């Protein structure tokens, strides 16, 4: 109902993402939210700790599973309002598009 980012104070985020960068050597913190104008369901959880070696596509696979979104319906992940290549590694998108607060913000829609 409210973009995670606007939901908490910077220091609260940078603190956590930093505590995350400590407790997990090869994991990645991802905030995954629904595009405002997409019909597809709103996920229950939006903070993920994705494995270093995980690809975009695979991560998509995970989101689909989370909303129980049927193979006919299409979904799309965006980063910085861009469509990362499905073959990419999440870590790479992170190191290249993370937020100043330490998280990699990702949105999904399909419609």
């Amino acid at each position: 109902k409210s973009t995670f980012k606007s939901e908490y104070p910077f220091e609260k985020r940078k603190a956590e993402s930093e505590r995350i960068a400590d407790r997990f050597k090869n994991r990645i913190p991802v905030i995954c939210e629904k595009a405002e104008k997409s019909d597809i369901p709103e996920i229950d959880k939006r903070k993920y700790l994705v494995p270093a070696d995980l690809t975009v596509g695979q991560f998509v696979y995970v989101i689909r599973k989370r909303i129980m979104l049927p193979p006919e319906k299409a979904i799309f992940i965006f980063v910085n309002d861009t469509l990362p290549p499905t073959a990419a590694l999440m870590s790479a998108i992170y190191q290249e598009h993370k937020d100043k607060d330490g998280f990699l913000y990702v949105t999904y829609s399909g419609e």
Binding site: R27, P29, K45, Y48, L49, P51, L54, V62
Partner: peptide, 6 residues
């Protein structure tokens, strides 16, 4: 809070 992927 956080959901870890395997």
């Amino acid at each position: 809070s956080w959901q870890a992927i395997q």
